[PDB]
């Protein structure tokens, strides 16, 4: 009924959605960096053993 409650709830919902999207993007970037690091480390270890 009031006009301030829709703006306050929409601003809090938008800020919480933006923070959740930023945290999910940071977690996805960290998981992709860790998976790329292990995926490089395995083939680097195998190629280093074969070259050794």
């Amino acid at each position: 009924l009031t006009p301030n409650q829709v703006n306050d709830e929409l601003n809090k919902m938008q800020a919480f959605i933006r923070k959740e999207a930023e945290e999910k993007a940071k977690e996805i970037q960290l998981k992709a960096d860790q998976e790329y690091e292990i995926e490089k480390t395995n083939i680097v270890r195998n190629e280093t053993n074969n070259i050794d």
């Binding site: 933006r18 998976e35 490089k40 680097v44 050794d52």
Partner: protein, 56 residues
């Protein structure tokens, strides 16, 4: 401003979805370059082994 918060919240949710899709594309790019790192490291290790063989 009752009908404006859903219109702004839809654009904010689409911006959050594109922000998640950009991080997924960056994770796919790092997963693509992860094999290129070791494939670029093996050719740098074989030349290091060849100097240790030619020195002996």
């Amino acid at each position: 401003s009752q009908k404006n918060g859903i219109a702004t919240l839809l654009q904010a949710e689409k911006e959050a979805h594109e922000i998640v899709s950009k991080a997924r594309k960056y994770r796919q790019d790092k997963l693509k370059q992860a094999k290129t790192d070791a494939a670029k490291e093996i050719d740098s290790y074989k030349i290091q082994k060849d100097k240790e063989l030619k020195e002996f």
